[PDB]
Design brief:
2 chains, Macrophage-expressed gene 1 protein (chain B), rod-shaped, toxin, little secondary structure, part of a larger assembly
């Protein structure tokens, strides 16, 4: 600010603004399935075959 | 020794497990007929 009635009447407003908005989302999904089946039903050769 | 004759006569299914059969006690697995099954 400034004022006077004799020699020095002025005005000033050196207003300033600095804003910096930074976001950082970071998502990481990971799925891993493994599944295994087994069956048996056995068979032998007869001990007297030719 | 064919059970198919009367499995055909009467419609029931033959039992699967049967005792009259040799068995390796070391390898621990069935081996073969010993007692005949008519």
């Amino acid at each position: 600010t400034e004022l006077a009635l004799f020699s020095r009447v002025n005005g000033k407003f050196s207003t300033e603004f600095q804003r910096m908005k930074t976001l950082q989302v970071k998502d990481q999904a990971v799925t891993t399935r493994v599944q295994v089946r087994n069956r048996i039903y056995t068979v032998k050769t007869t001990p007297t075959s030719e | 020794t064919g059970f198919q004759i009367c499995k055909n006569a009467l419609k029931l299914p033959v039992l699967e497990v049967l005792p009259g059969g040799g068995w390796d006690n070391l390898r621990n697995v069935d081996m073969g007929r010993v007692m005949d099954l008519t």
